[PDB]
Amino acid sequence: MTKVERLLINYKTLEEFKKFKEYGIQELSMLEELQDNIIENDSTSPFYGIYFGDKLVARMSLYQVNGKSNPYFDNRQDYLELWKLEVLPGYQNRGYGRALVEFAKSFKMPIRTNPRMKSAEFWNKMNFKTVKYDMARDKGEDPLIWHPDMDR
Amino acid sequence: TKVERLLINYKTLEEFKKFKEYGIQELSMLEELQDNIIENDSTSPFYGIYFGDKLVARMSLYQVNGKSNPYFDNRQDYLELWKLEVLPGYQNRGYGRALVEFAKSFKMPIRTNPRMKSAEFWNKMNFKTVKYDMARDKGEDPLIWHPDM
Ligand SMILES: CC(C)(COP(=O)(O)OP(=O)(O)OC[C@H]1O[C@@H](n2cnc3c(N)ncnc32)[C@H](O)[C@@H]1OP(=O)(O)O)[C@@H](O)C(=O)NCCC(=O)NCCS
Ligand SMILES: CC(C)(COP(=O)(O)OP(=O)(O)OC[C@H]1O[C@@H](n2cnc3c(N)ncnc32)[C@H](O)[C@@H]1OP(=O)(O)O)[C@@H](O)C(=O)NCCC(=O)NCCS
Ligand SMILES: OC[C@H]1O[C@@](CO)(O[C@H]2O[C@H](CO)[C@@H](O)[C@H](O)[C@H]2O)[C@@H](O)[C@@H]1O
Ligand SMILES: OC[C@H]1O[C@@](CO)(O[C@H]2O[C@H](CO)[C@@H](O)[C@H](O)[C@H]2O)[C@@H](O)[C@@H]1O
Ligand SMILES: [Co+2]
Ligand SMILES: [Co+2]
C-alpha cells in the first residue's frame, strides 16, 4: 500500500534528486527555474515518485509525446515517454518500480522507454517489448514499448 | 588520425561484442546479414580505428534531418554521433579524440547524447550542453558542437 505521488519542486526535493544516479540537465534547469521565479516553489513537474517515511525513495518522469512525428505505434498515435525510473539502494525489488510503472499504464496510453542495459529483465516483467530497430528513427537508443491489450 | 569506415560482416560484428554500448542496432545488423537482407561487406554508420587487426575504437555517425530536430540555428541538418567508445587498455591514447575529430572534419554541426562519467572528455572536445527543453529532450542530456567560422 505504497502510493504514487506527483512530486512538487522545491530545494528540499531537488536535494533528494541528487541521491539518484540518473541526474542531469533536467535537474539543473529545474533548479535554475526555481531560483529565477519564486512563484514556482512548490509547483509540479513531470515527476511522480514514492516516499517511505518522508524520504523520496523512487521516481519517474512522464511526458506525452506527439506520435505523428515519432513513428512508434499503430498509425502514429501519441504515447507517454517514461524516463528516469529509479529506486534508491535498500528499497529495490520491493515493488516500487512496478508500482510506478503500473501507474503510467493507468493512463491507458502506449508507453516508450529507453532503459539501462543492466535492467532489461525488469522491463521484461513489465511486459515491454523491443522495437524493430530503425536507424533513422532510433539512432543509438534501444527503445522498449508497451500498449493497452498487453499487460494492464 | 587512422579512422576507417567499418564494413558489416560476421568478423567485425563479432568484434562489436567486445564493446559495452552493444544493443539492438548490432542485433538488427546480424540478422539482416544472416537473413540475407544486406550484403556481406556492406557499409554502415560505423567508423572505427584498428590496432593490429583488432578493432579498438568505434562510433556511429549519421546525418539527421534538422527540420524535425530543432537543435541548431536556422534548423539546419547535423550529424548524430553515438556509441562512441574505446576498449580498455587503449583509453586516453587519442583514439576517442581521433574519431570525434574525424566527425568534426566535415564542418557540420554535431549532436551527441553522452555517457554518464564521460562528461570531462566531451568538454575537452568543446561540446556544449544544450539549454534543456523537456518536450524536445526528455531525459536525454544532449551535447552539441558546431564549427566557429
Ligand atoms: C530497475 C529498478 C527501477 C527496479 O527496482 P524495483 O522497482 O524495486 O523492482 P520491482 O520490485 O518493482 O520489480 C518487479 C519485479 O521484477 C524483478 N526485478 C526487479 N529488479 C530486477 C533486476 N534488476 N534483475 C532481474 N529482475 C528484477 C523483481 O524480482 C520484481 O518482483 P517479481 O518478478 O517477483 O514480481 C531499480 O532497481 C533501479 O532504480 N535500478 C537501479 C540501477 C540499475 O539499473 N541496476 C539494476 C540492477 S541492481
Ligand atoms: C572517453 C572515451 C569514449 C574515448 O576517449 P579516449 O579515446 O579514451 O580519450 P582521448 O585520449 O581520445 O581523449 C583525449 C583527452 O581527453 C581526456 N580524457 C578522456 N577521458 C577522460 C576522463 N574520463 N576524465 C578526464 N579526461 C579524460 C584525456 O585526458 C585527453 O586529454 P588531453 O588531450 O588534454 O591530454 C573512452 O575513454 C571510453 O570509451 N571509455 C568508456 C568508459 C567511460 O565512459 N569512462 C570514462 C573513461 S574511464
Ligand atoms: O503525512 C502523511 C504521510 O505522507 C508522507 C509520505 O507520503 O508525506 C510525504 O509526501 C507529502 C506529499 O506532498 C510531502 O508533502 C512530504 O514532504 C512527504 O513527507 C509522510 O510525511 C507521512 O508519513
Ligand atoms: O583496404 C583495406 C581492406 O582490408 C581490410 C580487411 O581485408 O582491412 C580492414 O579490416 C581488417 C580486419 O577485418 C583490419 O586488419 C584492417 O586494418 C582494416 O583496414 C578491409 O576492411 C578492406 O577491404
Ligand atoms: Co585518413
Ligand atoms: Co560549439
Q: Where are the domains of chain B?
A: 1-149
Question: What is the C-alpha to C-alpha distance for residues B109 and A90, in angstroms, rounded to an integer?
Answer: 43
CB B86 within 8 A of CB B54: no
Residue A118 in contact with partner chain B when CB distance is under 8 A = no
Residue B26 in contact with partner chain A when CB distance is under 8 A = no
CB B7 within 8 A of CB B39: no
Output the CATH code of domain B1-149: 3.40.630.30
CA–CA min distance B85, chain A (Å): 13
For cell 527555474, the residue is: A33
Q: What's the reported resolution, in angstroms, to a tenth?
A: 3.2
- What residues in A contact B80, CB-CB < 8 Å? 139-140
Question: In whole angstroms, how far apart are CA A124 and each of A3, A130, A146?
Answer: 23, 9, 11
Cell (9 digits) for B95? 583514439
CB A49 within 8 A of CB A8: no
DSSP E strands in chain B: the ranges are 4-5, 46-51, 54-64, 78-86, 110-112, 128-129, 143-145
- What residues in A contact B60, CB-CB < 8 Å? 139-140
Q: How was this structure determined?
A: X-ray
When CB atoms are compared, the residue of B24, B64, B139 closest to A83 is: B139
CB within 8 Å: A139 and B83: no
Output the CATH code of domain A1-152: 3.40.630.30
Residue B117 CA to ligand 2 center (angstroms) comes to: 10
CB B129 within 8 A of CB B111: no
- What residues in A contact B110, CB-CB < 8 Å? none
Cell (9 digits) for A77? 498515435
Question: What is the C-alpha to C-alpha distance for residues A139 and B25, in angstroms, rounded to an integer?
Answer: 8
Question: What is the C-alpha to C-alpha distance for residues B27 and B119, in angstroms, rounded to an integer?
Answer: 28
Sequence-distant (6+) residues with CB within 8 A of A108 are A148
